[PDB]
């Protein structure tokens, strides 16, 4: 009665997708994530898990703005000009 039959009353979801994190942890009654701490400004990040850090870092997704900063440093953050015409 604590096994197979107690697994038939499961129809009531606890967690749900976050709005900052993508993952499925947003506790509804309690209104926190459990992987990002959403409604707080600061990110949940503990140092007792190397793996848990390295899945979301600065170097993991697209970096759609840093990728060019690296290209612009290489010449000196020039702007406001053009090469020679033809």
Partner 1 sequence: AKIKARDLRGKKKEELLKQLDDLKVELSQLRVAKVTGGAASKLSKIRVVRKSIARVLTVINQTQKENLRKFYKGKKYKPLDLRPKKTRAMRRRLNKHEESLKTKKQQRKERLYPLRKYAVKA
User: Could you say whether residue 61 binds partner 1 (CB under 8 A)?
Assistant: no
Among 3, 59, 80, 85, binds partner 1 (CB under 8 A): 80
Q: Output the DSSP codes for 15-73.
A: --B-SSS-SB--BTTTTB-SSS-TTSSSPP--SS-HHHHHTSSTTSS--TTHHHHHHHH
Whichever of 15 and 54 has its CB closer to Zn ion, that residue is 15
Whichever of 48 and 79 has its CB closer to partner 1, that residue is 79
Annotated binding site for Zn(2+): 18, 21, 33, 36
């Amino acid at each position: 009665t604590k096994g197979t039959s107690s697994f038939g009353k499961r129809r009531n979801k606890t967690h749900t997708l976050c709005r900052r994190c993508g993952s499925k942890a947003y506790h509804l009654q309690k209104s926190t994530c459990g992987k990002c701490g959403y409604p707080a400004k600061r990110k949940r990040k503990y140092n007792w898990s190397a793996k848990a850090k390295r899945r979301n870092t600065t170097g993991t997704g697209r970096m759609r703005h840093l990728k060019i900063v690296y290209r612009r440093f290489r010449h000196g953050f020039r702007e406001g000009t053009t090469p020679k015409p033809k």
